Design a protein around this motif. Structure first.
Motif, PDB file in Angstrom:
ATOM      1  N   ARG A 213       0.812  -1.211   0.000  1.00 41.77           N
ATOM      2  CA  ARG A 213       0.000   0.000   0.000  1.00 41.77           C
ATOM      3  C   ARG A 213       0.851   1.268   0.000  1.00 41.77           C
ATOM      4  O   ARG A 213       0.309   2.358  -0.220  1.00 41.77           O
ATOM      5  CB  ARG A 213      -0.933   0.018   1.210  1.00 41.77           C
ATOM      6  CG  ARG A 213      -2.070  -1.010   1.186  1.00 41.77           C
ATOM      7  CD  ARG A 213      -2.710  -1.111   2.559  1.00 41.77           C
ATOM      8  NE  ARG A 213      -3.897  -1.963   2.576  1.00 41.77           N
ATOM      9  CZ  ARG A 213      -4.374  -2.563   3.663  1.00 41.77           C
ATOM     10  NH1 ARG A 213      -3.764  -2.429   4.841  1.00 41.77           N
ATOM     11  NH2 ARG A 213      -5.457  -3.314   3.575  1.00 41.77           N
ATOM     12  N   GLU A 214       2.150   1.149   0.265  1.00 45.96           N
ATOM     13  CA  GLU A 214       3.091   2.261   0.224  1.00 45.96           C
ATOM     14  C   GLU A 214       3.838   2.352  -1.105  1.00 45.96           C
ATOM     15  O   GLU A 214       4.705   3.220  -1.253  1.00 45.96           O
ATOM     16  CB  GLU A 214       4.115   2.126   1.366  1.00 45.96           C
ATOM     17  CG  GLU A 214       3.510   2.003   2.768  1.00 45.96           C
ATOM     18  CD  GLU A 214       4.493   1.446   3.793  1.00 45.96           C
ATOM     19  OE1 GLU A 214       5.712   1.432   3.517  1.00 45.96           O
ATOM     20  OE2 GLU A 214       4.044   1.013   4.876  1.00 45.96           O
ATOM     21  N   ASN A 215       3.519   1.482  -2.070  1.00 46.75           N
ATOM     22  CA  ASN A 215       4.355   1.328  -3.261  1.00 46.75           C
ATOM     23  C   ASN A 215       4.356   2.571  -4.142  1.00 46.75           C
ATOM     24  O   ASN A 215       5.353   2.835  -4.822  1.00 46.75           O
ATOM     25  CB  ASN A 215       3.888   0.125  -4.079  1.00 46.75           C
ATOM     26  CG  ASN A 215       4.803  -1.074  -3.944  1.00 46.75           C
ATOM     27  OD1 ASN A 215       5.687  -1.113  -3.089  1.00 46.75           O
ATOM     28  ND2 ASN A 215       4.588  -2.068  -4.795  1.00 46.75           N
TER      29      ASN A 215
ATOM     30  N   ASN B 285     -14.426   5.827  13.644  1.00 47.95           N
ATOM     31  CA  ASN B 285     -15.141   7.060  13.344  1.00 47.95           C
ATOM     32  C   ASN B 285     -14.362   8.329  13.675  1.00 47.95           C
ATOM     33  O   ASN B 285     -14.955   9.410  13.695  1.00 47.95           O
ATOM     34  CB  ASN B 285     -16.486   7.070  14.054  1.00 47.95           C
ATOM     35  CG  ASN B 285     -17.521   6.285  13.293  1.00 47.95           C
ATOM     36  OD1 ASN B 285     -17.411   6.129  12.075  1.00 47.95           O
ATOM     37  ND2 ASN B 285     -18.522   5.775  13.996  1.00 47.95           N
ATOM     38  N   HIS B 286     -13.061   8.229  13.918  1.00 50.77           N
ATOM     39  CA  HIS B 286     -12.179   9.383  13.819  1.00 50.77           C
ATOM     40  C   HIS B 286     -11.489   9.464  12.462  1.00 50.77           C
ATOM     41  O   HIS B 286     -10.644  10.343  12.264  1.00 50.77           O
ATOM     42  CB  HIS B 286     -11.126   9.344  14.928  1.00 50.77           C
ATOM     43  CG  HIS B 286     -10.172   8.198  14.809  1.00 50.77           C
ATOM     44  ND1 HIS B 286     -10.394   6.979  15.413  1.00 50.77           N
ATOM     45  CD2 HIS B 286      -8.995   8.082  14.148  1.00 50.77           C
ATOM     46  CE1 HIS B 286      -9.392   6.164  15.136  1.00 50.77           C
ATOM     47  NE2 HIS B 286      -8.529   6.809  14.371  1.00 50.77           N
ATOM     48  N   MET B 287     -11.821   8.567  11.534  1.00 55.86           N
ATOM     49  CA  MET B 287     -11.234   8.530  10.203  1.00 55.86           C
ATOM     50  C   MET B 287     -12.227   9.059   9.175  1.00 55.86           C
ATOM     51  O   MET B 287     -13.437   9.115   9.415  1.00 55.86           O
ATOM     52  CB  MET B 287     -10.829   7.100   9.806  1.00 55.86           C
ATOM     53  CG  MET B 287      -9.915   6.362  10.780  1.00 55.86           C
ATOM     54  SD  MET B 287      -9.875   4.567  10.470  1.00 55.86           S
ATOM     55  CE  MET B 287      -8.707   4.043  11.724  1.00 55.86           C
ATOM     56  N   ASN B 288     -11.696   9.443   8.013  1.00 60.37           N
ATOM     57  CA  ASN B 288     -12.519   9.685   6.834  1.00 60.37           C
ATOM     58  C   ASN B 288     -12.846   8.345   6.185  1.00 60.37           C
ATOM     59  O   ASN B 288     -11.941   7.613   5.771  1.00 60.37           O
ATOM     60  CB  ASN B 288     -11.792  10.603   5.852  1.00 60.37           C
ATOM     61  N   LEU B 289     -14.139   8.027   6.086  1.00 58.89           N
ATOM     62  CA  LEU B 289     -14.552   6.667   5.747  1.00 58.89           C
ATOM     63  C   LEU B 289     -14.181   6.295   4.312  1.00 58.89           C
ATOM     64  O   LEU B 289     -13.745   5.165   4.055  1.00 58.89           O
ATOM     65  CB  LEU B 289     -16.056   6.510   5.969  1.00 58.89           C
ATOM     66  N   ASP B 290     -14.367   7.213   3.359  1.00 63.19           N
ATOM     67  CA  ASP B 290     -14.020   6.912   1.971  1.00 63.19           C
ATOM     68  C   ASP B 290     -12.521   7.061   1.725  1.00 63.19           C
ATOM     69  O   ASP B 290     -11.941   6.306   0.935  1.00 63.19           O
ATOM     70  CB  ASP B 290     -14.808   7.816   1.021  1.00 63.19           C
ATOM     71  N   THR B 291     -11.879   8.026   2.386  1.00 63.68           N
ATOM     72  CA  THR B 291     -10.423   8.110   2.340  1.00 63.68           C
ATOM     73  C   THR B 291      -9.791   6.785   2.751  1.00 63.68           C
ATOM     74  O   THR B 291      -8.847   6.303   2.111  1.00 63.68           O
ATOM     75  CB  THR B 291      -9.933   9.237   3.252  1.00 63.68           C
ATOM     76  OG1 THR B 291     -10.669  10.434   2.977  1.00 63.68           O
ATOM     77  CG2 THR B 291      -8.443   9.494   3.037  1.00 63.68           C
TER      78      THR B 291
ATOM     79  N   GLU C 237     -10.890   3.606   2.578  1.00 65.46           N
ATOM     80  CA  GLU C 237     -10.961   2.539   1.585  1.00 65.46           C
ATOM     81  C   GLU C 237      -9.925   2.742   0.486  1.00 65.46           C
ATOM     82  O   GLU C 237      -9.261   1.787   0.061  1.00 65.46           O
ATOM     83  CB  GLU C 237     -12.375   2.463   0.997  1.00 65.46           C
ATOM     84  CG  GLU C 237     -13.475   2.030   1.997  1.00 65.46           C
ATOM     85  CD  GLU C 237     -13.410   0.551   2.381  1.00 65.46           C
ATOM     86  OE1 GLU C 237     -12.411  -0.121   2.039  1.00 65.46           O
ATOM     87  OE2 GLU C 237     -14.367   0.058   3.022  1.00 65.46           O
ATOM     88  N   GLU C 238      -9.750   3.986   0.030  1.00 64.64           N
ATOM     89  CA  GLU C 238      -8.770   4.258  -1.017  1.00 64.64           C
ATOM     90  C   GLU C 238      -7.348   3.983  -0.533  1.00 64.64           C
ATOM     91  O   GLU C 238      -6.551   3.370  -1.253  1.00 64.64           O
ATOM     92  CB  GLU C 238      -8.916   5.704  -1.498  1.00 64.64           C
ATOM     93  CG  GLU C 238      -7.972   6.109  -2.632  1.00 64.64           C
ATOM     94  CD  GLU C 238      -8.345   5.480  -3.965  1.00 64.64           C
ATOM     95  OE1 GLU C 238      -9.415   4.833  -4.047  1.00 64.64           O
ATOM     96  OE2 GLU C 238      -7.562   5.641  -4.931  1.00 64.64           O
ATOM     97  N   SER C 239      -7.009   4.420   0.686  1.00 64.61           N
ATOM     98  CA  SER C 239      -5.658   4.203   1.199  1.00 64.61           C
ATOM     99  C   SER C 239      -5.357   2.720   1.413  1.00 64.61           C
ATOM    100  O   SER C 239      -4.199   2.302   1.291  1.00 64.61           O
ATOM    101  CB  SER C 239      -5.460   4.971   2.508  1.00 64.61           C
ATOM    102  OG  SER C 239      -6.191   4.378   3.569  1.00 64.61           O
TER     103      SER C 239
END
Ligand code: MG
Ligand code: MG
Ligand code: MG
Ligand code: MG
Lengths: 508, 506, 503, 505
Positions: A177-179, A491-497, A499-501
Motif C-alpha cells: 500500500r506504500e508502493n 469514526n475518527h477517520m474519513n470513511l471513503d479516504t 478505503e482508497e488508502s
C-alpha cells in the motif's frame, strides 16, 4: 535501495541443497527460486545450535564475540544486528517467526515483530560445565523424536509456522500500500520458520509425497559407542540413546516426515513469492534463503546438531534478485557472511559495518572475485564439556577441543568424513596441513579464555535463574502489539479516504 | 529471617549526615532513625552519577565490572543483584521508585516493581569520548537549576515521590496481611525517591522551615575557571556555566530548597516508620538509609556530582533494626558494601556471594570489628574525556586520570580538600604515600584497557540508538502490572472470606 | 499519404524494450522515439528464426502459409508483401539491408534494394526431419559467439550495417529532392540492420558505455540438460553445448557487447531522424521500429532463438508519427500485424488486404479499440523434429508439439516461465485453460498436415541443392544497380545542379 | 555414361510424325534420325500450352503438381527437373533456346543457359477465371497469323532459332575439346527451337519445297460455331475468330509455311548431327526429339493449341543412340515420361526419381516390355473457365470439364474424333467404358479442389503483377554470361592455348 525478503528455516541439512534443492525433494518453488539465485553449496553455520547460530547470524559475529554460547545465554541489546544496520540506513525492518533471542530484548533492532517466539526467552536451558556427563531430561534433546515420527494434521510447530506464513504475507500486502509513495522506506522482512526441526511429524498430504522415496536411510549408518569419537559419544549420552531402540523403520519414518516438512515449507515459499508478484514488488526485492544449522538425520547414528560434521554444520544459502548473478559457488562460506552481505546489498559502506562483523560480504564472490577467508565455527553448549572450534578452508575441515583428539578431514577425497587424517595421516602433506591448522587455531582463539568465559556465563545464570523462578514469574516473551482501536474503519477517520488508502493497486 | 526496608534518596550530600542528619536540618524522623542506627560517617558512592552508582549499588560491583559506565549504558540482566540474592534465599522483593536501569530489563531480580522510572530506560544519554569538549544541551546538567530554584506545590519530582511513598506504604499494609502466616516469605522493599536531586524546587511548607538557615552559603566558594583543576573545568564547561550568572541569592535559594526537600523526604520517612509501627512489623524489620551520590551544592563553585570531591562522592549510610547495635563509624565505607551486607543480614553464606561482590559486609563493623579494606571509585561519563579512578583509605583520598595531574588529599588535616599533596607534598611521608597509591592504582586498574572498554561501549550504542530512533519507537519503560479483575471484591470469590483475609490485625 | 520509415534490427530481445528501451540501456535516440510512439510491450515474432520471421513479416502470413519454414526455404515471388501492397497504392518502396529472402527473387515487391544481403540466398541451410538429432556444424548456431565475445573496431556485421545506414540516409536525401513536386510518390523505406545478432563484438566506444552495467548476467541461470524441457534439450545439442565451456565471464562479455551493439544501433537511429528533420520530412513520416526475433542471451542457459520462451519470441514494436497517439499497450500483438497496420496507415482498404494477411491492423488499437485476437507463432526448422506452434492470449502462453509435453505459462504470475502449468496446474482454472487452448490449437492448425508439408519441402530441396552445388555455381545474391549519375555531357550542366539541390 | 542431346521444337503437330516425319515432308535428317530411333507414335503433351507443357516436361509432373497452370504461372525453383537429376548424377547440363520458364529462376537446374528466352519471364499473361468470356488482345492468340502467312528472309523467330542453332553447335565443339580427357563429365545439351510455332512465315528456300504439296488443307474442315463443342467455342471466341475472314488460301499459306519451317528445322538437325559426327561424339550420344504441344493447323476450323484434340495434344517423341533398339511403338506415351526415361538412361536408380515424377521410363518399352499406365493431360489456362482433364488409355480418349459435356473417342474406329461416344454410345461396351473413365477421373482428380487452386494462383498474381508494373521495372529475363577470359589473353600461355582449343589433336 531494494527490498529484502529473508526466508529462514530451522535445522535444514545443507547437503540436501547440492545445487538448490536435491532432485528427490518435492520442492518446486525452492527449485524455481534456486534457478534465479546465487547458490552457495558449501555454506556453514557459525554454531550448530539454535540460539548461538541465530544471535551470530543476526550480528555477523561469532558466539565467542556475541557471548551467546548456548540456548539460554543472554543476547545484549547493545550488539548491532543487520536490523540495526538496515534500519539506520532507512529500512523498515520486521520479523515474522522464530529467532530464539534470550533475554528481555525480543527485537534486537527489528522495528516490528509479528509473532512471539516458539521457544523460551529465559535462562532455563543453561548447561553446566561443572557437572560433565549429566543431562537435563526436561530440555535436552533425546531420540524420542526418532521413535515418535509420523503423521498429524496439526502440531505445535505447524500452528506456529502456519501463523508465521499468514502474518508474513499480510505484512507484504500492507507494505504494498506504500508502493506509490515517493517517500516510502524500503523494507526488509525476515520470515523465520521452525520446520524442518523435529518433532519429525508431517501433514499427510506432504508425507504422501515420499512413499517411494529412495533416501530414507543414510549412506553412513550407526557407529557403535565404542567406535565413536569422544564428542559424538557425548552427544549420544546427552540424547539418552541407551533408553531408545531406534529401528530402521524409525530412521525411515523420521527422514520421511522431515522431507515432507521441507515440502510443507516449499508451499509457503510459493505463497510468499506469489504475494510479492501480485503486489508488484518482486522486481525490486532481494530474496535470501537460509537456515541456522543442520540435522544429521541418522547419519553416523547421530540426530540433530551440536557437532561440526557436514549434516549438522552445513546449511543452505541462496540469494536472488536485482544485481545478483545466478550460479553455483563451491568456495566455503559462512552464515557470518549474511549480515555484511545484506549491508553491502543495501548500499551501506564497508567501513560502517567492518567494526561490527566477523564475516565478509559475498557480493564480490557473486561478481567473480575469489573469496579466500576461512570459515570458522564454534560450539560451547550441551554435550560439550569444553568449547570446540572448527576451521573450514579449501578442501579441509579441522576440529579442535582441548579434551579430544583433533579431527582433520579432506572433504574432496572423503566427503563423508570417514577417515580422520589427524589420527591417520596419508603422508607428510597431511602432517604439514595439521600443523598449519594448529597455527591458524592459535591465531584465532584463546581456548583457555573461551572456556573460562563460558563457565562464568553459566555460573551467573544459575544464580539469577534460580531467583527468577521463585515467586511470581515475569515473562520476557514477545507479545505482538495491539492496535484494534486504530485498525479497519473507525469514526475518527474519513470513511471513503480509508478505503482508497487500504486498496492497492489503485485506480484499476 | 528479618524483613528489610531500604530507603534510598537521590543526590544527597553525605557531609549533611555527620552523625545522622546535621543539627540544622529539620529532619526529626531521620534523626530518630539515626539514633537507633549504625551510622557510617565516611560512606562513599562507587561512581558519582545516577545509573553507574545504582547498577553498582544493586550488584555490589564497580562500573568497570558491571559495564554500566554512564547514564545510558545497558545493564545486563544476567548480573546478580541483591534482589536475586535475597529472592533466591526466599524473600519477596519489591521496588517502589527510581533505579535508572538502562535496557529492556527494568526489574533486575526485583519480583515486583510498583512505579515506572522517572528517568529514561534507553541509550539516549550516551557520552562520546571521540568528541571531547562537546556538550549535549537537551540532557546535560546546566546551572539553570541554580538560577531557577524556588517554591512550588507540585513538580515532576514531587508527583513522582508522592506516588513512590503512597505505593510503598500500601505495599507494607498489604504485606502485613501475611504476618500471621507461619509460611510467609520475609520481604525486602526498596523505596527509592528522586529528591533531593534537582530542580531545587520545594513546597512552601518545607521551604519556610529554613527561613533563618545559616548554611545557605558553602564555606568554600567559587574557584575561577583558570584556577580550577582540569576535571572541575570540564564539569563547569559541561554545565554551560558561562551562559549563567549565578548570584549569591541563587546559591542560597538552591541550597534552601534542597534542605527543604530533605525535610519533604523526612516526612515520608516518618510515614513509612508509622506504617511499620501500626502493622506490628517494625521490630522484625531492618531499615537502611542510603543514596546513590552526592551534590556539591555550590561548594568550590560546583553543582551536582560527576567528581570525587567530598560533596559529590560522600553519601549517607545507616542501618537499624534487630541485631544492629547503634553507633557512629568513621572508617571509610562504600555503597559497594550494601549488597554483601544485605546478604549477610539475611543469613546468606559469604561463599554464596563472594564471586559476585567486590565489597565487604559491614555486619562485622556493626559488631565492633575493625575494617581495613580501601574504598574504590570510578567515573567514566559526561565531563570525563578518559576514565577517572579514586582510592579512599585511612585519612587519604587519591584521584587519577591519565590526562590530569594526580590529586592527593589528607582529609584529617584538610577536610575541604584545599591542598593537593601530590602537587604540594608536606614532606617525605606525603611522597611515599603518593607512590604507594600509584602502585596500588596500577595493580587494580589498567586505565588504557579501561578507556578502550568505555569507547567500545559508546560506539556500540551510537550505532544501535540511531537505528532505534528511526521508525516506530519501542519503549522499555517499566509498566506496573494491571490486576483489576483480581482486586477487591469479585464474584469468583467468597465475599465474607475476602473481608477477613484483607483485614489486619484480625 | 504519409511516408513510412521502417527501422528493423535483427535478434533483439523484446524484454529489453519494456516501455521503449530499458533504462539501463544507453539509447537516447530510441528512448526519444519511444516517448512519441505507440509502444507494444508484449509483441511477438511469428517464428523465432531469421528467414521464417522475415518472410512472415513481409507477407503478414504465418510460415505455414508462406511455406518459408526454415532459413533455406524458397519464398515464392507470387506471395504479396507489404511492398506490393504499398507499391500498388502508389508508393515508392525500397530496402536497405537484410531480409534473408531465399530463392532467386531478392526484391519480393521492393522497387529498389540498396544493398545485397549479408546472408545466403540459396538452399544451403535446409534441415531434414528424416534425420532427427543430427547437427550441421558449418552453419548451425554454436556457442563460439559466446566464448568469443569482445571488442573490435570493424566486423563483418559493422561493415554491413555502416553501409546500410549510409545508403539509407543517402536515399532519404535523394527522396527529399522530389519533396517540392506534388506529383511525387509517397515513399516507404525499410532500413534493416544485422545487429545486435551475434558475433557479440562491439566497438570500444559502445563497449565502454556498459562498464558499470547491472544486467550482464541473465535473470535465470543455466538449467542442466536433464532438467530442460525436450525442445530446449534439442537446442542445446544443436549448438553443440557440450563442446564449449561457457564461463560467467563469457556470459558477461556477450551481454555487454550485445548491449553495446544496441547503443551502436541507437546512434544510427539518431542519424536517420536527423536526416528526416533537416530535410523537413519528419512531420509527414511514420516511423516503425521492429525486429525479426529475440535472443535468450544466456537465460535458462540458452543463447539465440529457435524457441518460444520470452527472450527468443518477444521483439520490440513501436510506431510514431502523423495520426499515432503515443502510449503503452500491454495486450499481446504480433509481427504478423505489421503488414495490415502499414496498409491501413497508407489508406488501403481492409478488403484489399484481408485475403492476404493472418494478422490485424493495430491502428484501431492505437485509437483505444480493444484488440481480442490471440497471437500465433510457429517453428519448423533446426532443433525441431516436428513443427511446434504457440498461442499467446491474455496472460497465457501455450506451446504444442506432437512429440513433446505441452507447456502452459501464466506470464503475470510467472514472467520467467519457471512453472509449466500443463504439467503442474495450480487448480481447476489452469486445467480448464489448458483444455481451451487445446481446442484453440485444433481450430488453427492441422499438425499432421503441417508436418507433411514441411517434410515434402525439405526433401525437394535436398534433391535440388546437391545438384546446384555441382559444376559452376549460379549465385542468386542481389547486386544493386554511373554513366547516368552526377554530371554527364548528355544533361544540362546548370539544370542538373539545381535538380540535385534541396531545399 | 552417355552424352544426351535433346532436340526440342515448339508447336509441332504429332500426327505429322506417323513413323518419323511424314513422307510428304522434306525432312531427310529427321527421317535418317527416325530410322535409328525408337519412335513413339501415340505420344502426348501433358498440357496443350507452352509454359505448362514445358514446366511439366522438365519436372516430369503434371500442371496440378507443378502449379504452372498457364503461361504466367511461377515455376518454383525448388521443383526438381531432369536437369537436377542429371546434374546430381555427374552431368554437365545446358540449354540453348526457349523454355518459357516464368519467374526469376531462368535455369531450373541447368548449369548453363546459352540464350535468353524468346518469350517473357513475368506474370503478364495471367488468365482470370473471375472474368469468363473476356479476352486480353495484347497476348492472346488470334487468327492474324493465319491471314498473314507468307515469306520472309528474317523474322523474330528465325533470328532466335539461327542463334540457338549456332550457339548449340559452338557448344558441342567446345565440349569435344574435353573428349581426350577421360576425367570430363558427360554432357546433356537441350536445344529448344521456337519453330514451327507461328507466325507462319518461312524463308523462300524452304517455302519453295512445298510448291506441289498435297496436304495444304486439313481433312476435317471448319465446324461452325453453333455446332462446336463448348470448349472449341471458347477457343474460337478467344482467338477472336469473328474478326478474321480466313479463306481457303489463308489455310494453305499457313500450312505451307508451317511445313517449310519444319524443313528449316530439319536443316538445323542436320547441322547438329554433322557436328556430332565430325567431333566423334555421335556414337556415344543419345538423341531425343520432342515438342511441347501440337497445332491444329486448321483441322476442325481450329488453330494452335489449348485443347485435347489429336492435332493439339499429340507431339512427336523419338530416342536414338547407344543401347536404343530402333522401332515403332503404338502404345500411348506422354511427355511426362521424358524425365524418368532420361534418368534411367543415365543410370539413375528408379527410387531416386520415383517421388518426383508422375510418368514412367520408356526404356523397358524400347526393350520389349509392355507399358500399361495411362496418359493423363490437364489444361487450365486461357479459353478455360474451369480446368479440363483428359485420359488416354489403350484405344480411348476421355475429356472432362465440369462445365461441358463429356467427350469419349475410340481412336481406332474414329481417328479424326468425329463421333463423341459419351453422347452417342454404340452399346453397353461404350457405356461401361465411359463409366470406367468417370470412376478413373474421379480417383485421380478432385476437380473442385483443382479449380480452387487455379483461382488462388490467379488472384495472387493479379495483386502482385499490378505492383511490379508500377515504378521502375525489374526484369527476370536470362542474360547469358566473359570476354576477358576468352581467346588469347596475356595471363595464359600462348602456345598452350592453341593446343587446348584444337580438336582433334
Ligand atoms: Mg535451530
Ligand atoms: Mg542520581
Ligand atoms: Mg534474425
Ligand atoms: Mg509453346
Amino acid at each position: 535501495k531494494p527490498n529484502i525478503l529473508i526466508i529462514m528455516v530451522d535445522q535444514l541439512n545443507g547437503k540436501l541443497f547440492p545445487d538448490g534443492p536435491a532432485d528427490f525433494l518435492h520442492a518446486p518453488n525452492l527449485k524455481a527460486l534456486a534457478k534465479r539465485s546465487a547458490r552457495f553449496h558449501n555454506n556453514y553455520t557459525s554454531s550448530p545450535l539454535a540460539a548461538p547460530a541465530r544471535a551470530s547470524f543476526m550480528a555477523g559475529q561469532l558466539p565467542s564475540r556475541t557471548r551467546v554460547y548456548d540456548n539460554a545465554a543472554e543476547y545484549q541489546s547493545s550488539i548491532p544486528t543487520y536490523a540495526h544496520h538496515l534500519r539506520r540506513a532507512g529500512y523498515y525492518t520486521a520479523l515474522s517467526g522464530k529467532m530464539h533471542l534470550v533475554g528481555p530484548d525480543q527485537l534486537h533492532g527489528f522495528e516490528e515483530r509479528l509473532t512471539t517466539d516458539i521457544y523460551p526467552a529465559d535462562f532455563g536451558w543453561t548447561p553446566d560445565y561443572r557437572k560433565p556427563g549429566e543431562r537435563i531430561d526436561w530440555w535436552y534433546h533425546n531420540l524420542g523424536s526418532v521413535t515418535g515420527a509420523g503423521v498429524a494434521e496439526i502440531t505445535n510447530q505447524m500452528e506456529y509456522d502456519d501463523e508465521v506464513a499468514f502474518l508474513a504475507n499480510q505484512k507484504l500486502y500492507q507494505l504494498s500500500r506504500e508502493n506509490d509513495d515517493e517517500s516510502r522506506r524500503p523494507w526488509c522482512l525476515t520470515v523465520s520458520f521452525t520446520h524442518p526441526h523435529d518433532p519429525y511429524v508431517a501433514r499427510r498430504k506432504f508425507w504422501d509425497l515420499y512413499e517411494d522415496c529412495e533416501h530414507l536411510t543414510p549412506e553412513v549408518g550407526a557407529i557403535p559407542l565404542d567406535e565413536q569419537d569422544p564428542h559424538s559419544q557425548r552427544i549420544m549420552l546427552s540424547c539418552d540413546y541407551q533408553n531408545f531402540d531406534v529401528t530402521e523403520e524409525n530412521v525411515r519414518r523420521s527422514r520421511r516426515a522431515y522431507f515432507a516438512n521441507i515440502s510443507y515449507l516449499d508451499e509457503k515459499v510459493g505463497e510468499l513469492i506469489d504475494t510479492l508478484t501480485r503486489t508488484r514488488m518482486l522486481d525490486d526485492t532481494l530474496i535470501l534463503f537460509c537456515s541456522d544449522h543442520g540435522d544429521m538425520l541418522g547419519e553416523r547414528g547421530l540426530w540433530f546438531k551440536m557437532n561440526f560434521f557436514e549434516g549438522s554444520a552445513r546449511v543452505p544459502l541462496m540469494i536472488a534478485g536485482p544485481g545478483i548473478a545466478p550460479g553455483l559457488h563451491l568456495t566455503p562460506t559462512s552464515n557470518l557472511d549474511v549480515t555484511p552481505t545484506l549491508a553491502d546489498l543495501a548500499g551501506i559502506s564497508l567501513e560502517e559495518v567492518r567494526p561490527w562483523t566477523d564475516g565478509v560480504s559475498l557480493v564480490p564472490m557473486v561478481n567473480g572475485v575469489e573469496r579466500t577467508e576461512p570459515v570458522l565455527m564454534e560450539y560451547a553448549a550441551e554435550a560439550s564439556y569444553a568449547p570446540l572450534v572448527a576451521i573450514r578452508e579449501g578442501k579441509w575441515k579441522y576440529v579442535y577441543c582441548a579434551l579430544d583428539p583433533e579431527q582433520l578431514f579432506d572433504l574432496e577425497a572423503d566427503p563423508l568424513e570417514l577417515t580422520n587424517l589427524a589420527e591417520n595421516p596419508r603422508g607428510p602433506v597431511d602432517q604439514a596441513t595439521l600443523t598449519a591448522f594448529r597455527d591458524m587455531r592459535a591465531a584465532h582463539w584463546d581456548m583457555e579464555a573461551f572456556d573460562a568465559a563460558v563457565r562464568e556465563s553459566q555460573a551467573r545464570r544459575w544464580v539469577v535463574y534460580e531467583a527468577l523462578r521463585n515467586g511470581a514469574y515475569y515473562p520476557w516473551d514477545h507479545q505482538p502489539l495491539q492496535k484494534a482501536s486504530e485498525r479497519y474503519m473507525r469514526n475518527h477517520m474519513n470513511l471513503d479516504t480509508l478505503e482508497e488508502s487500504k486498496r492497492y493497486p489503485r485506480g484499476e
